[PDB]
Design a protein around this ligand. Structure first.
Ligand SMILES: Nc1ncnc2c1ncn2[C@@H]1O[C@H](CO)[C@@H](O)[C@H]1O
Ligand SMILES: Nc1ncnc2c1ncn2[C@@H]1O[C@H](CO)[C@@H](O)[C@H]1O
Lengths: 445, 445, 445, 445
């Protein structure tokens, strides 16, 4: 080991140690433990607009009760929405099943907190991050990378590498006990059949009973919308308009939003009433092993429909093709924690400039249950869709004549003959089966 | 002009002329007109398992009443399903809107009839095809290519290039009159606000009122399913199991199908009861102008869900990535009429072999209305999804340790520093905006 | 036909007609003919820095002798070099044979003259271009597109569609005669075994004897360099330094160039003395038929070596991969005449910004004959190549330890087992042949 | 730590340990040391047709002198050539500088020895490989993967993790001393300013003085060819013919080769006399850090020219595009040690079937010095290059007319107008700079 080794396996006694303080059991016990053992902890709670968080202000207050040197709320909502919109603009979603898309809400979230919490730590003179992200997940890598990109002098302390931490804490029962012995009644929540990670872009549910592919969405109580699959849940058809100005979502139902955070919060409400955007995916972790999740993203799903519809009516085939190619590649880079790397920047800026800036328009749709919806109208001054330009009603307005089309067809013949000749060559070399045959099963070569 | 000139602008009097005889007004009047003018027409009606065709046998019988020299039914169902399954296996679908996919059912249909009807014509000594496909659509090019690939000596007569055809026929009122004057009361079907093309893979609706983006699925009476968007339409939730064996769909609801045509007919019934698979798309025609359609494909949509789900649980990330890249490229080639060209064969065979052959398994789902469904179970002996291999419960079974993961992280540092340095270089050259700023809007460079 | 039909098949008598006046036989005879027949011709001669053009000023003077209403020289050199540099920066070259690259000098040239000559015509109130580009080449399409993009009201008159032009002119002997009968002794050049098209980016040789693949570079007298393959040609080894600043070539042999045109002219001289950059290619024309050429581009070949070398020492693997992917796609768009279309802009700007702006450095090489050269040095403050950062000499400076690498390897096991299991599955389904076998040829399944 | 832990940090005393015995100082001392310490070593020497190996038979004989339990020569030449030919067919080369290509000869070599030596070990009941491949290179990962794919029960002992090995051996002086103390005067070869790895596909030189980019090919004494850059080296121009049959190289200079190993040995001799194929590359290692090499591959370079030339004359543009796209992706997978993984198989088989099987023909060239050569002839019954099919000499043979081409142009107008309108939209949103300007530098927005 040396001075520039990033990972610290032992608690840095007497030093300032930053903690991404969500206020759950793990971070609460860790913070208390770090103080007890001699470190000086600084708590940073990310305000991510979590749909299941009732009161962010209460969290720093508990950090101080547990002995934090300082505790603050870092507002990450604006950035989260801006990165979410950038991902949307670039179609940066690589996880999908028969078209149903996962909007990479977890990786976007990590890109935001990994950079913003480390920067907040740096401003307070905190160059050590006591990051509990586990050895078997994706976040250990994402946070490692985002952290070091933000603060080159960052050291990362991994408590689970410290035998004293493993012995005194460990499982949830031991951590819950450690809290109680220090005089803090940690209000243990009612246990669920899965784990949840959330932010205002979306929520992901996985692990525990969701590890079995025989279980699924039926066991999930959604936190950003209703259980649309249950008959007792009454959902009436609802018309919605979504308006974009140069790629930025600016209005919902004719109401203009100067604040994009407020706009996404309203998109979330609209999609949420219908259960729009939920999916079930098997994803490939960074370590090359699969995991399974149930996902929610009602607001982004709503915006995705409108943005895509406009893209298909505004951009040419090659542009749409590059957009989709770039997006799948960018999605994977995002998932790996490389959202700010040069290769990702290239893909991202290309979409923000040449694809998104032309997207000025409005899409009208009807939402019913889950992903059942209908398109009602699509409007844009930038549309290239124009059946009137294809009108052959008058000879004076027709773009081309029947004779012109025949001329175009004649240009295909040379390559057609080349292809037919390839087919015959492929039969002779045994790659393709001959055209003609027998009326009964036949003997092969 | 030249002996190898494909297009004939004049009726070839006294010669054998093939007609793709659907039996609608256009082909009925054309066939009668061609006979009256001296040509010898041969009618070929493609049995495509059309969902709106009540009796295929009656069509050749009418061709003979109109003076056809001969009239045959060419059974294209087996081939249509085989090509549909190949497309499915290769994810050869390039037209989509926010994930909702068009299954290229029209282009697959043309690849089958364009080759099979021309081959049937050749057997009867017919080397001229009186093809009415219009000068402004995609099919004129698709049929031109498929036809010439099948029969190098094929000539194509386009009635609309013949001034005598334009003068005597033309609009539907003139054709309907021509029928009546020849003693045939052509029972014209009730007029619709759109045109429909169909086969057992799917149905497409476009033109007329569907040209307006302010109109949509609401004006369409579906022919392969119910009007799922109307509240008065009662749809009961339904559980379905779909089983694949080495990429081929072999069973539905535990019932094994030796005949793939019968299997797709049942898949169509199941999906049809729910309205599964309908979408609204703006597509890019071969001529680089956009058109709009409302699409149906209930059976293929059902199979796509199952196939995709299995692919995500069986194949590694690079394999899935190549599969999807190849599919979007292949979809476009298919749409262009290049399904049998070498570049298409490459993409297609790759999927049929290395992607599809590993797809042995069964997916269980619940269908509700439209594209609202839930996954209930996923089973396969070929799954690489395996949370038990990730289990750290025993030291003797864990694939890696916490210390091993730290080792992996340390391997990232060199490139992380390179990326951070790129970011600083990009700020200096003015490509990226600086990190730090002011509390109020600031003057830029 | 209608008012917005671009192509005019008849000479527009009494109207202003622009001619891209190169001053060769075709344009000289056409200009004279157009005046004689009543049109009012305006001549525009592109100054392209042609290596075989001794005096551009003399050309407009001849246009006026032939009866041009006006004649001017449009300087296209600055733009030609800027577009050439942009292509270079984006590696926009899709035609190559075993790595030997064609720098798309003809298509770049057409993008420049097609836009610039049409703009010059517009400023003089000339909205008709009498473009002689032939019906069987690529340029007819390129000029059509570039012209209409530049001037939406442009009409293009194609003399070869005019029966009066075909009758009075036609072959070279007839045109040469037409000149003589009008009192102009057109000084007919000594005939060559091939046709040449050139500009300061490069020169292309094709047609006539070069149509035979049994002929090649041996019959070509190069115009931008020496015949390096001939023993009588003495070529001494020469050291050269090429320096870039943020992607722009700025110095050669320590001499800084404020004018990029002068820099390329010197690069051409340096590469030309050695015959650097020549190649033999079979390309695919827009009409899907092949053509063959012998190419020269000594200056661009020199710059390409230096730029590429720097790219490989500065950018990460993913960045280089996107750069090369984008370049091959962009090259094809360029060749089609779509250099200014949105899909091309995307690819081009991406390279100019994220790839090229980091390319600040200097490459030293030794040129011998043809493409035989050696790299002597590569320097750049932006290099990520840094063997000293990989030095394990001191424990205090090593980036990772041996134990760290072992940790990284353990992360591969799960996918390795999945791959081995796929291999066994592929043998069972018959896709792959088993590993073990017999000592003699064996019977198959 | 775990029964399936691959890496062994301690010498397995009393157990059978396989050693890839090249017979250099490192493997000689290691083998002797392992025996002395109680292990039972089995030596396997790969016959790779190394250009610098004078006598393979002498190596096993020395292994036995040093105390090997058994020592065998495993003939890897046939497989090496077959994998080399497969790579060639698929253009699986991703490392290049201005077109000059590195033929991935080291990674191909590792794929062959990593699998073949492990299989040979298994036959002898040896399930432990004492692999000295270092902690900072690529081969540690390649061998790890190839080994485990071949033998799932393989354990890999890394001597450098054993403190007893580090203490007693270590540097070359210590190993050379250990040999002498055991009674073996190891005749150390003359020291070089770089390290070399070789096989009959090619040779790579790197490390030591080649780490400096100010040094290069000038300090290398080539082992597969002459020092073509030195004037004193006399090289006579030489004509060569290379013939392929369905993608397999079968003849050189009219002499047919039934044995591909013999064919490559002759190709190596021909290219070697000229120094054909040498290059200087900066590559990206698996660990995301760069390294520099000087490479030789005269035989493969010769075959690459012929294969590529034939590909350009036989295959259509889309086919060539897919071929090159697939190749760059496959090259990277090959470099990573994933040559036998599913995603690599897909790319590889596609080329072997649809690209290579059509490559039947012969290319004639003249080789001079280094990469300076000329193409003299290209012949193939499969060529699609055919200027006679483009001949407009007779009206009865012309594929299209001038009027037909005009028809084709008219089909471009709609998209041209869409693109022009995009350009105006991009100026309005500030993405593109306006067309018109001032005669002097102007104030911007
Ligand atoms: N036409 C296309 N060609 C290749 N890849 C495409 C295309 N369209 C979209 N993609 C996407 O490219 C991704 C990776 O490049 C794939 O996941 C695929 O979905
Ligand atoms: N890694 C890669 N994957 C795919 N295509 C690539 C890669 N590198 C370069 N290319 C280029 O992409 C082009 C078209 O996309 C091909 O002509 C090919 O040369």
């Amino acid at each position: 080991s040396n001075a520039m080794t990033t990972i610290l396996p032992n608690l840095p006694t007497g030093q300032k140690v930053g903690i991404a303080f969500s206020g759950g059991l793990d971070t609460s016990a860790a913070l208390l433990w770090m103080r007890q053992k001699g470190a000086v902890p600084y708590a940073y709670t990310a305000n991510l607009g979590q749909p299941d968080e009732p009161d962010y202000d209460e969290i720093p207050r508990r950090a101080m009760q547990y002995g934090a040197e300082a505790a603050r709320l870092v507002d990450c909502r604006a950035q989260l929405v801006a990165e979410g919109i950038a991902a949307l603009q670039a179609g940066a979603f690589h996880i999908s099943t028969a078209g149903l898309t996962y909007f990479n809400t977890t990786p976007i979230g990590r890109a935001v907190t990994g950079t913003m919490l480390v920067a907040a730590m740096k401003e307070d003179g905190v160059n050590i991050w006591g990051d509990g992200s586990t050895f078997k997940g994706n976040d250990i890598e994402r946070f490692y990378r985002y952290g070091l990109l933000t603060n080159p002098d960052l050291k990362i302390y991994k408590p689970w590498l410290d035998q004293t931490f493993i012995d005194e804490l460990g499982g949830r029962a031991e951590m819950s006990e450690y809290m109680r012995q220090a005089g803090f009644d940690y209000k243990m929540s009612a246990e669920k059949a899965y784990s949840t990670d959330s932010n205002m872009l979306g929520a992901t549910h996985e692990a525990k009973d969701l590890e079995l592919l025989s279980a699924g969405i039926r066991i999930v109580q959604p936190i950003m919308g209703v259980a649309f699959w249950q008959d007792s849940v009454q959902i009436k058809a609802e018309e919605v308009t979504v308006r974009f100005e140069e790629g930025q979502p600016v209005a919902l139902n004719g109401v203009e939003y100067a604040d994009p955070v407020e706009l996404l919060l309203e998109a979330n409400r609209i999609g949420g009433r219908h259960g729009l955007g939920m999916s079930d995916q098997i994803e490939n972790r960074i370590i090359e092993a699969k995991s399974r999740g149930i996902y929610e993203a009602p607001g982004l799903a709503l915006l995705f429909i409108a943005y895509e519809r406009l893209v298909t009516g505004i951009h040419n085939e090659d542009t749409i093709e590059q957009y989709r190619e770039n997006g799948r590649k960018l999605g994977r880079l995002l998932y790996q924690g490389r959202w700010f790397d040069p290769q990702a920047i290239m893909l991202r800026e290309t979409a923000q400039r040449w694809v998104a800036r032309a997207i000025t328009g409005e899409v009208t749709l009807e939402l019913r249950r889950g992903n059942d919806y209908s398109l009602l109208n699509t409007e844009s001054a930038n549309l290239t869709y124009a059946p009137e330009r294809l009108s052959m009603e008058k000879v004076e307005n027709a773009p081309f004549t029947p004779a012109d089309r025949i001329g175009q067809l004649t240009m295909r013949n040379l390559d057609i003959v080349d292809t037919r000749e390839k087919l015959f060559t492929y039969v002779k070399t045994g790659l393709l089966a001959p055209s003609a045959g027998s009326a009964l099963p036949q003997i092969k070569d």
